[PDB]
Design an enzyme around this catalytic site. Structure first.
Site, short mmCIF file in Angstrom:
data_model
loop_
_atom_site.label_atom_id
_atom_site.label_comp_id
_atom_site.label_asym_id
_atom_site.label_seq_id
_atom_site.Cartn_x
_atom_site.Cartn_y
_atom_site.Cartn_z
CE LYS A 1 10.37 -15.44 -5.50
NZ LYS A 1 11.18 -15.11 -4.30
CG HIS B 1 9.06 -13.97 5.57
ND1 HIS B 1 9.82 -15.12 5.62
CD2 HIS B 1 9.13 -13.53 4.29
CE1 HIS B 1 10.34 -15.35 4.43
NE2 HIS B 1 9.94 -14.40 3.60
CD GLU C 1 13.86 -12.57 -5.19
OE1 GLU C 1 13.41 -13.44 -5.97
OE2 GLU C 1 13.19 -12.10 -4.25
CD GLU D 1 6.70 -16.82 1.80
OE1 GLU D 1 6.53 -15.59 1.66
OE2 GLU D 1 7.17 -17.32 2.85
CD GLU E 1 11.87 -16.07 -1.16
OE1 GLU E 1 11.02 -15.15 -1.16
OE2 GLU E 1 12.12 -16.78 -2.16
CB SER F 1 -0.96 0.01 1.20
OG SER F 1 -0.28 -0.25 2.42
MG LIG Z 1 11.90 -11.55 -2.84
#
Ligand SMILES: [Mg+2]
Ligand SMILES: [Cl-]
Ligand SMILES: [Cl-]
Ligand SMILES: [Mg+2]
Lengths: 434, 434
Positions: free
Chosen positions: B394, B158, B293, B210, B167, B40
């Site tokens: 992904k 997270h 990434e 996830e 990740e 947002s």
């Molecule tokens: Mg990412």
């Protein structure tokens, strides 16, 4: 009209294990349905067929069930020329073709997958929404939106915590509508996450198979206090009530019940079913607990009957009825419980699930449509609970979309019914009075 | 043909938060699409519109975005009489009614919802599967199935552990097909669950948003050893490689990086970008890491270009590019990375998402279609990665059905393509060679 083609395949359920999906083609198009995870073992419940090849998915493939559908079931239903609206004709035809009591030749997963696709195909052949078509299959006309039961606290064999009792649920019985019941359950679930995060740490907010938290809690009283706290913190004290799935068959040890069953076996803590009910009465008097599932063992009928007559809350049979009609007949005359957990894949077909529900309803029982721990993106049971007018469904926390897909579909059903929509509310046990 | 009706509503996503769903009606029926969770606030990316009502869903409601669709966007697109195949026209018309650059008036969630439903309806108007209609909108002819990148270990923002990087993914590049790639991922995923429960305890097996695990570990090196150990025990060392999302913006502080962040603050442990690149170099040399990434902060352009030019692996931009064409133009110019992460809701339009992808592929970049942390049961991006011939996606662990829905849908696309189906395999970075 006729079934033109049936093609089945393997997909992965919400836990990464194989399950059956069925595409049924008629003149009106494609009708797809998937099957939740069941058990390939057990004396009473219908058995899903597993491949057992340990090299492949550690033996959890369903290639054999998929083949039984494509090679054997499909040409038989095509040759019958039966319309897809004839649900009971098609289900009984596959029952005799399997020829076994627990559907062990084709597998309950293979039979249910076709049965669900048939119903969806028959609903469009009827030009009816799926829930409407199911209602006419069950002889119903006044539809009702159910009270959702959100699994928010997990224990027992489901989690690594020492908590012995399996599920601690929340019921927004005081909601204005089902869409409002979602907002209540979701806000209380998000509030509970912060409560667990501050009290037990940031690592205690990860979820289990159906989206509920599993904080390392020994005693169920703290689970009920934890839920009670989050309800009050969210400001819904009298709008939301607690339901329980004890799954006491998991910790029935040496004739007693061991709520420290994650421990090295020790005679020092086990108590008798009578003393277990005293803890339940203290649960019901201290907490807003209106529903308890599997309070005792699946064969400890004495404590079951003795508890139901002694109490006034809802007692729902899961492991002792296994959606098995003849076992339900016993629990009726024995008055072991007053509510039936309806796991459609435990019986194996839509026809037999409808008759199992209507059998409980004609005897004043409640019915709660249920998910499985292994679910898919299929949303059949959402329409099922509306057409059956059950008034109460448990299909996970408001987390993980194999759960939300059902809750989202129920919100779509309420919006479609419009002014004819009724929310069961405080009448989730007997919605036929609204 | 012309759009008959567009009705938008509010559903719950995989975390329990409201998001947009759009029902578009043409003469060929209903076409439904849901939007994943976006942001947002943000300087570059398109912004989703949140209600801000702290009393309702803690401000997460999307009633305003839904009203913009039903009251403003829907009457204008229907009035235009534009055929639903004119994706670019209808997307452009919505971009001008909104009138702002980052879609902050109507919301990126409101505009994307309509854009997705227009695309599904356009495919049926062409009597084509969705992925084939996307291929014609992108000017593609030969389709490709992507290598899946399963999130498996989680750290960063997270996660309750000390693990700084976000990740750790597995990619079954050596698989025979996409279906075989799903088998390899699921078997390794279940294998790691066993290794985690044995080494860290039964309470360490629960999953994040996830679907991956988050054991309490500090060393990023231990996370890679954990995944490598699970690959080897599943017997797939040849076939499965490792991808990483470090999400370096999360632990970028003043001018250094704090790999022991989410801990008591101490600038003495802060390391420079050169030091962080040297830590990456040791990872690539010691583990089968083929993709990284966000190795550096979203504005540390010098670290990006220097590291990409001194390495041979794939370098993915996420927060660097935020699926924004102008940011991509600068990233191409300065050679900051060689792979674009494509988040459709970060750009807010199908037409622009195709443009952003064709811009990257024209410059020799790879593309990785991406899920969001908050997903739904919608499967659009599965058809999207195939239609764009991207070769890599992904969209979660093989756990939680908001992740499996796309993976299963890709398996369905693979069998629908039949002999024409191609698996990207070891050419997931440059699938055009196939
Ligand atoms: Mg990412
Ligand atoms: Cl279960
Ligand atoms: Cl995200
Ligand atoms: Mg149960």
């Amino acid at each position: 009209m006729s079934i033109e083609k049936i093609w089945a395949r393997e997909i992965l359920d919400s836990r990464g294990n194989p399950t059956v999906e069925v595409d049924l083609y008629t003149a009106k198009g494609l009708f797809r349905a998937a099957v939740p995870s069941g058990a390939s073992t057990g004396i009473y419940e219908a058995l899903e067929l597993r491949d057992g090849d340990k090299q492949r998915y550690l033996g959890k493939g369903v290639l054999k069930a998929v083949d039984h559908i494509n090679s054997t079931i499909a040409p038989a239903l095509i040759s019958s020329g039966l319309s897809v609206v004839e649900q009971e004709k098609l289900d009984n035809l596959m029952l005799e073709l399997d020829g076994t009591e627990n559907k062990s030749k084709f597998g309950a997963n293979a039979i249910l997958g076709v049965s669900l696709a048939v119903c969806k195909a028959g609903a469009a052949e009827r030009e009816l929404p799926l829930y409407r078509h199911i209602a006419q299959l069950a002889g119903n006309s006044d539809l009702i939106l159910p009270v959702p039961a959100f699994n928010v606290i997990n224990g027992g064999s489901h989690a690594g915590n020492k908590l012995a009792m399996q599920e601690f649920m929340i019921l927004p019985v005081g909601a204005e509508s089902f869409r409002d019941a979602m907002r209540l359950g979701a806000e209380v679930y998000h509030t509970l996450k912060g409560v667990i995060k501050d009290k037990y740490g940031k690592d205690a907010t990860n979820v289990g198979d159906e989206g509920g938290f599993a904080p390392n809690i020994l005693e169920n009283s703290e689970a009920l206090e934890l839920v009670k706290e989050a309800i009050d913190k969210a400001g819904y004290t009298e709008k939301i009530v607690i339901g329980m799935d004890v799954a006491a068959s998991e910790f029935y040890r040496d004739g007693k019940y061991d709520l420290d069953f994650k421990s090295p076996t020790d005679p020092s803590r086990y108590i008798t079913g009578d003393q277990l009910g005293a803890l339940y009465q203290d649960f019901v008097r201290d907490y807003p607990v209106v529903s308890i599932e599997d309070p005792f063992d699946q064969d400890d009928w004495a404590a079951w009957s003795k508890f139901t007559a002694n109490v006034g809350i809802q007692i729902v049979g899961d492991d002792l009825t296994v959606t098995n009609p003849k076992r339900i007949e016993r629990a009726v005359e024995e008055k072991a419980c007053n509510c039936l957990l309806l796991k459609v894949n435990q019986i194996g077909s839509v026809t037999e699930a409808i008759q199992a529900c209507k059998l409980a309803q004609e005897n004043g029982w409640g019915v709660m449509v249920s998910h499985r721990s292994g679910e898919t993106e299929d949303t059949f049971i959402a329409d099922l609970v509306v057409g059956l007018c059950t008034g109460q469904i448990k299909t996970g926390a408001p987390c993980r979309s194999e759960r939300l897909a059902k809750y989202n579909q129920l919100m779509r059903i309420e919006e479609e019914l419009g002014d004819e929509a009724r929310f069961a509310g405080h009448n989730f046990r007997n919605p036929s009075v609204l």
